Design a protein around this ligand. Structure first.
Ligand SMILES: COCC(CCO[C@H]1CC[C@@]2(C)C(=CC[C@H]3[C@@H]4C[C@@H]5O[C@]6(CC[C@@H](C)CO6)[C@@H](C)[C@@H]5[C@@]4(C)CC[C@@H]32)C1)COC
Ligand SMILES: COCC(CCO[C@H]1CC[C@@]2(C)C(=CC[C@H]3[C@@H]4C[C@@H]5O[C@]6(CC[C@@H](C)CO6)[C@@H](C)[C@@H]5[C@@]4(C)CC[C@@H]32)C1)COC
Ligand SMILES: COCC(CCO[C@H]1CC[C@@]2(C)C(=CC[C@H]3[C@@H]4C[C@@H]5O[C@]6(CC[C@@H](C)CO6)[C@@H](C)[C@@H]5[C@@]4(C)CC[C@@H]32)C1)COC
Ligand code: NA
Ligand code: NA
Lengths: 242, 32, 258, 226, 161, 117
C-alpha cells in the first residue's frame, strides 16, 4: 500500500499541475479558432489538412484526460459534475468515428466550445460568476414556474376571447403562448396589436384587446420579468455572506 | 489516405506521453 | 334556523363535499382547456353546451347552499366572492342566450365572447384544488415576498400612472392633427403613452410626427422617457431587491435561531 | 478654460457654415490648444521623471495627446484625405475627457464605480462565450445549409449581430419571422431558449452583480467616513 | 480481483457473437478476453492467531509471510482527494494487506460488523470508539519491519496537542 | 441627490458620442441613394444628440446600423464599432449603475431607520 500513494501523489501533481492546464486550455482555444475559421467556405479547404489534424489531436488528449481521471477510481471521477460534463462531451465526440449520423458539424462543433467552460473555471475571477449562476438556478426555476403558471391562464382567456378573430395569434394554446412571450419580452407586440386595429371597421374589441395587453404587460413584464434580477441578487449576497 | 490522421493523432499523444513518463522516473532518481 | 342551518353547515364543510366540488371544478377546467384547440371545440360543441348547463346547475346548488349555511360570512371570504361573481356572470350569460337567437350573428357579436371569457374565470377555482394537493409551496417564498412588496408597489404604480395621465392630457391638447392616427382620441393618446412606457417603436412616433406635423414632440418624449422608464421602473426594481434582502436577513436569523 | 474652449470650438465645428466663416479662428485656436496641452505634458513630466507615470490621469492625458497627434500625421504625411480621415478627426470628441481630472466628486465616483471592472469584464467574457457557442449553432443550422437564411446567419460577422439583436431584445421577432418563413422547425426553440439564457438570466445577473458590488463599496466608504 | 475477471469475461461473451456488418472494423475484442482470465488467478484466507499474537499470510494453502501481533489496534489512514473530499484507507498494524478501507465512507452497519470483527479478532477498534474524523493510532507490532514508516506511522498520527 | 455626478458622466458621454457621430456619419447624411430611411439622424448636432438618446434606449439600433451599411461609403468597421460600443457602455452598463445606486440608497434608508429603532 505504501507505494501507490506516491503514484497517486504523482497523478495529482500532474493532473492538478498548472502547466498541464495551460496547455490543455491552449489546445482547446486553438481548436475554437479553427472552428471559427472553418465557418468560411474558402478557408475551409486551404488548410483542411491542418484543421483535421488539430481536430483529432485535441480529441485524443481529451480522451487521455478522461482516462487519467478514471485511473483514480471510477466512483470519485463520477462523484462530480464537471467530470461527467467533460465525459459526455468527449463521448459524444468519440462515437462519431463509429456511428455516421452524429459525426456532423451541427453536433460536433459547438460541443468543442461547451468543453471550454470548465477550462475557463480555472480563472476564478470568472469562476465565481458561474458558481453564482449555478447556485441561483433553483430559485430561477421557481420564478420561471411562477411566470409560466401565470402565462397559461392568460393564454386561455386570450384564446377564448380572440378566437375566430385575429387567428394569426390566438387560435390554440401554443400560438397564444408564443404571442404572450412576444409581449412579456416587450418588443414587437405593438405590431401584434395593429392586427387588432387592422380591420374594415371595428371598435368593441380593440379596446378589449388593449385592456388585455395592458394588464399582462403591467403585471408580468414590469413585475414578473423583473424578478430574475432579485433572485440573482438574493443568491449572490448569500454567497458573499456565507 | 485514412491511416494518416488517426495515426498522426496517436503519434503526438504517445510522443508527448513519453516526456510525461520521463519526469515520473526522473523524479525518482532525484529523491533517491 | 338552528338545526336546519347547522346540518347544512355540517354537510357543507364536510370532507366529501369539498372533494366532490373539486372533482367538478377539475372536470370543468379540463373541458375548458379542451375548448382551446378548434379541432375539438368545433366537433364536440353539442356535448360541451350540455356539460356546461350541467355545471351551471351544480354551481346553483353550491352557491345557494353555502349562502344559506353561512349567512354573510359567505360574502365575507374573497375566495367565495370570486365564485359568486363567476356565478353571476354564468347566470347572466345563460339568460342572455335564452333571450337571443343562437346564430352566427350572435357568435360574432363581441358581447357573447366577452361573457364567455368570464366562464374561463372558473379555471381560477382550480388553484384551490392545487392548494390542497399542494403546489409544493415551491413558490410560497417568492409569493410571500411579493406579498410583502405590494404595499409600496401599488403606490409607485399609481404615481407613474398619474404621470402617464397628465402627459396624455397635455399631448392630446397639443398634438392633434399632427398624426391623428395615433392620438385623435383621448383614449388612444393614453394608450400611445402607455405603449411608449415599454419603449417599443417609440422613435417611430417621433419620426411620424416630424414627417408631416412638427418635431416639438421630441423634448416632451425625451423627458417622458427619462421620468418613467429611467427613474420609476428602476424604483420598482429597487424596492423589490430591498424587500427580498429583508426576506434573506429574516431567513439567516431564523436558521441561526435553531 | 483651455479645455472648455476647445470643447466649445469642437461643437461649433460640426456646422460647415460656421466652419467656413471664421475658419482662421478655428485654425489658430486648434494650434494654440495643442501647444498648451503638449507644454503641460512636457513640463509636468519635467518636474518628475518616474512618478509621473504613477498617476492614472497622467496616462489618460498622454493618451489624449497621442490621439491628438495621430490624425494630424495621417492627413499631412500619409495624406490621401482618406476614407477614415474624418473618423479620427471626429474622435477628438473625447479630448474633453481631460476635464474629468478636476471635479473631486466625479473622482470619488470613479473610485466607487470603476473599482468594479473585473466583475464587468468577467460578465462580458461570459456573454461573448455564450454568443460564440450560439453563433456556431445558428450558422450550422440556418447558415451553410444553402436552403435557408443565408446573409443573416451566413457568417459570424452576421451571426453575432443577429444574436446580439436577440440579446438586447430589440427586434428579435423580425429576424425570427424571416427565419420562420423558411420552414425551419427548430428555430422557435433556438430563439426562445437564447432569449431566456442571454436576456432574462444573464443581463439581469449583470444588474445584480453591479448592485451588490456597488453596495458593498459604498457602505465601506460610508463606514470609513463615519 | 475475480470480480473484474467476472466482469470482463461476461463482456467478451456478449461481444463474442455480433454482426457489425461494417467495412474493416475487425472484430478483435479478444484483446479484452486475455485480461479477463488474467486477473482470475487462488482464494485468500487470513487467520488471526491471537493465541500467540501472530499473523501469518497465505492464500490457497501456501504460506507467504508471517509476523507477530503483540501490539494490536485498528488504524485507518487518510486518503485525501484533489477535490474538497475525504476518503478512508484502512492500514492495520502498519502492514500492507488487502485494503479493508471503509467502503462508501462518504456505513453505520458497515462499521458495525467491524466492531464485532475487531471484537471477534480480539484487537482494539480505535477508529470506532471515537468515530468522527481522522482519529486512529496504529499499533504496529514490533514483529513488523516497517522502520521508515512504522516510526513514521506515529508522525502522521495526531498526539492530541 | 446621491447620484449627482453620475449624471455628469452621462452628459459628458452624450457630448462624446453625439459630436463624434456627426463626423463618423457624414457621407451617410450627404448621400444620394434614392431609397433610404434614416438619412436624417446624423444631419446636424441636435439630430445627433437625439439619435444618441434613441440608441441609449435600444430602439431600432440594428435597423439604423443596416441603413448606415446601405451606403457604399462608411466602412462597416467604424459604424459597427461606434454603435456597439455605445450600446455596451452607454446602454447596458450605465443604465445598470443607476439601478445599483437606487438600491443602495434604499439600503441606506433602511439602515438609519433600523439604528434609530
Ligand atoms: C392567511 O394566511 C394564509 C397563509 C398561507 C398562504 O398561502 C399562499 C401560498 C401562495 C399562494 C398560493 C397564495 C395566495 C396567492 C397565490 C397567487 C395568486 C396568483 O394567482 C395566479 C394563478 C391564477 C391566475 C389567474 C393569476 O395568477 C398565480 C400565478 C398566483 C398565485 C396562485 C401564486 C400562489 C399564491 C396562498 C397561512 O397563514 C397561516
Ligand atoms: C393560504 O390561505 C390564504 C387565506 C387567505 C386567502 O385570501 C384570498 C382572498 C381572495 C384572493 C385575493 C386570493 C387569492 C386569489 C385572488 C384572485 C386571483 C385573480 O387575480 C385577478 C387579479 C389579477 C388578474 C391578472 C387576474 O384576476 C382577480 C380578478 C382574482 C383575485 C385577485 C380575486 C381575489 C383572490 C387570496 C388565509 O388562510 C389562513
Ligand atoms: C401564510 O400566511 C400569509 C398571510 C398573508 C398573505 O398575504 C398575501 C397577500 C396577497 C398576495 C400578495 C400574497 C400572495 C400571492 C400574491 C399573488 C401572486 C400573484 O403574483 C402576481 C405578481 C407577479 C406575477 C409574475 C404574477 O402575478 C400578482 C398579480 C399576484 C399576487 C402578487 C397578488 C397578491 C398576492 C400574500 C398572513 O398569515 C398570517
Ligand atoms: Na424595445
Ligand atoms: Na422593436
Amino acid at each position: 500500500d505504501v507505494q501507490e500513494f506516491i503514484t497517486q501523489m504523482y497523478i495529482k501533481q500532474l493532473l492538478r499541475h498548472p502547466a498541464f492546464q495551460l496547455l490543455l486550455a491552449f489546445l482547446l482555444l486553438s481548436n475554437a479558432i479553427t472552428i471559427a475559421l472553418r465557418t468560411n467556405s474558402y478557408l475551409g479547404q486551404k488548410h483542411y489538412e491542418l484543421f483535421s489534424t488539430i481536430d483529432d489531436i485535441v480529441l485524443t488528449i481529451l480522451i487521455c484526460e478522461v482516462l487519467l481521471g478514471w485511473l483514480n477510481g471510477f466512483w470519485i471521477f463520477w462523484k462530480d459534475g464537471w467530470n461527467i460534463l467533460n465525459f459526455a462531451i468527449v463521448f459524444i465526440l468519440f462515437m462519431g468515428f463509429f456511428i455516421k449520423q452524429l459525426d456532423m458539424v451541427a453536433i460536433t462543433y459547438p460541443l468543442r466550445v461547451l468543453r471550454l467552460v470548465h477550462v475557463c473555471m480555472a480563472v476564478e475571477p470568472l469562476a465565481r460568476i458561474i458558481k453564482v449562476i449555478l447556485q441561483s438556478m433553483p430559485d430561477l426555476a421557481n420564478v420561471m414556474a411562477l411566470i409560466l403558471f401565470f402565462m397559461l391562464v392568460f393564454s386561455v382567456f386570450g384564446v377564448t376571447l380572440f378566437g375566430a378573430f385575429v387567428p394569426k395569434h390566438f387560435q390554440n394554446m401554443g400560438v397564444a403562448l408564443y404571442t404572450l412571450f412576444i409581449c412579456i419580452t416587450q418588443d414587437g407586440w405593438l405590431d401584434i396589436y395593429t392586427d387588432f386595429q387592422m380591420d374594415e371597421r371595428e371598435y368593441a374589441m380593440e379596446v378589449g384587446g388593449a385592456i388585455y395587453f395592458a394588464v399582462f404587460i403591467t403585471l408580468g413584464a414590469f413585475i414578473g420579468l423583473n424578478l430574475f434580477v432579485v433572485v440573482v441578487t438574493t443568491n449572490l449576497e448569500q454567497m458573499m455572506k456565507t | 489516405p485514412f491511416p494518416g490522421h488517426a495515426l498522426i493523432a496517436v503519434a503526438t499523444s504517445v510522443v508527448l506521453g513519453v516526456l510525461i513518463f520521463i519526469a515520473f522516473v526522473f523524479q525518482l532518481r532525484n529523491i533517491h | 334556523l338552528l338545526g336546519l342551518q347547522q346540518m347544512i353547515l355540517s354537510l357543507t364543510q364536510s370532507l366529501g363535499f369539498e372533494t366532490f366540488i373539486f372533482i367538478v371544478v377539475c372536470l370543468n377546467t379540463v373541458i375548458l382547456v379542451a375548448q382551446t384547440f378548434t379541432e375539438l371545440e368545433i366537433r364536440g360543441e353539442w356535448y360541451f353546451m350540455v356539460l356546461d348547463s350541467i355545471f351551471l346547475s351544480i354551481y346553483v346548488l353550491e352557491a345557494v347552499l353555502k349562502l344559506i349555511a353561512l349567512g354573510l360570512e359567505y360574502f365575507y371570504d374573497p375566495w367565495n366572492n370570486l365564485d359568486f361573481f363567476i356565478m353571476v356572470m354564468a347566470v347572466l350569460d345563460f339568460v342572455l342566450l335564452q333571450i337571443n337567437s343562437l346564430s352566427y350573428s350572435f357568435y360574432n357579436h363581441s358581447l357573447f365572447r366577452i361573457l364567455k371569457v368570464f366562464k374561463s374565470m372558473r379555471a381560477l377555482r382550480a388553484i384551490r384544488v392545487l392548494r390542497r394537493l399542494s403546489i409544493l409551496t415551491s413558490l410560497h417564498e417568492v409569493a410571500g415576498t411579493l406579498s410583502g412588496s405590494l404595499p409600496s408597489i401599488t403606490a409607485i404604480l399609481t404615481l407613474m400612472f398619474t404621470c402617464l395621465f397628465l402627459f396624455s392630457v397635455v399631448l392630446r391638447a397639443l398634438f392633434q392633427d399632427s398624426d391623428p392616427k395615433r392620438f385623435q382620441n383621448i383614449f388612444t393618446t393614453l394608450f400611445t403613452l402607455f405603449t411608449m412606457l415599454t419603449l417599443d417603436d417609440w422613435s417611430l412616433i417621433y419620426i411620424d410626427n416630424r414627417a408631416q406635423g412638427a418635431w416639438y414632440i421630441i423634448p416632451i418624449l425625451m423627458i417622458y422617457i427619462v421620468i418613467q422608464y429611467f427613474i420609476f421602473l428602476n424604483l420598482v426594481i429597487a424596492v423589490l431587491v430591498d424587500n427580498f434582502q429583508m426576506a434573506l436577513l429574516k431567513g439567516l436569523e431564523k436558521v441561526k435561531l435553531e | 478654460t483651455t479645455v472648455t474652449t476647445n470643447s466649445f470650438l469642437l461643437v461649433l465645428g460640426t456646422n460647415y457654415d460656421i466652419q467656413f466663416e471664421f475658419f482662421r479662428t478655428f485654425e489658430v485656436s486648434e494650434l494654440f490648444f495643442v501647444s498648451v496641452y503638449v507644454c503641460e505634458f512636457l513640463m509636468k513630466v519635467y518636474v518628475d521623471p518616474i512618478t509621473y507615470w504613477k498617476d492614472g490621469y497622467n496616462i489618460l492625458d498622454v493618451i489624449i495627446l497621442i490621439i491628438l497627434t495621430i490624425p494630424y500625421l495621417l492627413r499631412k504625411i500619409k495624406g490621401n484625405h482618406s476614407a477614415y480621415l474624418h473618423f479620427a478627426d471626429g474622435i477628438q470628441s473625447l479630448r474633453i475627457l481631460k476635464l474629468i481630472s478636476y471635479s473631486r466628486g466625479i473622482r470619488t465616483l470613479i473610485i466607487a464605480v470603476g473599482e468594479t471592472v473585473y466583475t464587468v469584464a468577467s460578465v462580458l467574457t461570459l456573454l461573448f462565450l455564450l454568443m460564440f457557442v450560439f453563433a456556431i449553432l445558428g450558422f450550422c443550422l440556418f447558415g451553410v445549409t444553402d436552403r435557408g437564411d443565408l446573409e443573416n446567419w451566413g457568417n459570424l460577422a452576421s451571426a453575432f449581430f443577429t444574436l446580439f439583436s436577440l440579446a438586447t431584445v430589440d427586434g428579435w421577432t423580425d429576424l425570427q419571422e424571416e427565419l420562420d418563413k423558411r420552414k425551419f422547425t427548430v428555430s422557435r426553440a433556438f430563439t426562445i431558449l437564447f432569449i431566456l439564457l442571454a436576456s432574462f438570466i444573464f443581463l439581469n445577473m449583470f444588474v445584480g452583480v453591479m448592485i451588490m458590488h456597488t453596495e458593498d463599496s459604498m457602505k465601506k466608504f460610508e463606514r470609513d467616513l463615519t | 480481483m475475480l470480480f473484474i475477471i467476472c466482469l470482463v469475461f461476461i463482456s467478451c461473451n456478449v461481444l463474442r457473437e455480433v454482426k457489425y456488418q461494417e467495412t474493416w472494423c475487425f472484430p478483435a475484442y479478444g484483446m479484452v478476453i486475455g485480461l479477463w482470465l488474467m486477473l482470475s488467478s487462488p482464494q485468500r484466507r487470513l487467520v488471526l492467531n491471537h493465541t500467540r499474537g501472530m499473523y501469518h499470510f497465505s492464500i490457497q494453502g501456501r504460506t507467504v509471510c508471517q509476523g507477530p501481533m503483540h501490539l494490536v489496534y485498528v488504524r485507518l489512514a487518510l486518503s485525501s482527494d484533489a477535490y474538497g473530499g475525504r476518503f478512508f484507507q484502512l492500514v492495520l498494524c502498519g502492514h500492507k494487506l488487502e485494503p479493508l478501507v471503509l467502503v462508501q465512507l462518504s456505513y453505520e452497519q458497515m462499521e458495525f460488523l467491524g466492531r464485532h470483527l475487531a471484537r471477534k479478532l480480539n484487537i482494539n477498534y480505535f477508529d470506532y470508539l471515537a468515530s468522527s474524523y481522522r482519529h486512529v493510532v496504529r499499533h504496529w507490532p514490533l514483529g513488523a519491519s516497517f522502520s521508515p514508516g512504522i516510526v513514521q506511522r506515529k508522525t502522521q498520527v495526531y498526539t492530541k496537542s | 441627490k446621491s447620484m449627482t455626478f453620475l449624471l455628469m458622466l452621462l452628459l459628458i458621454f452624450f457630448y462624446i458620442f453625439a459630436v463624434t457621430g456627426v463626423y463618423f456619419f457624414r457621407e451617410y447624411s450627404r448621400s444620394t441613394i434614392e431609397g433610404l430611411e434614416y438619412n436624417m439622424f446624423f444631419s446636424d448636432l441636435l439630430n445627433s444628440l437625439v439619435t444618441v438618446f434613441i440608441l441609449f434606449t435600444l430602439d431600432h439600433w440594428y435597423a439604423v446600423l443596416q441603413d448606415i451599411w446601405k451606403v457604399p461609403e462608411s466602412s462597416r468597421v467604424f459604424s459597427s464599432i461606434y454603435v456597439i460600443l455605445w450600446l455596451l457602455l452607454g446602454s447596458i452598463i450605465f443604465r445598470n449603475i443607476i439601478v445599483a445606486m437606487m438600491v443602495t440608497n434604499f439600503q441606506n434608508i433602511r439602515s438609519e431607520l433600523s439604528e434609530e429603532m
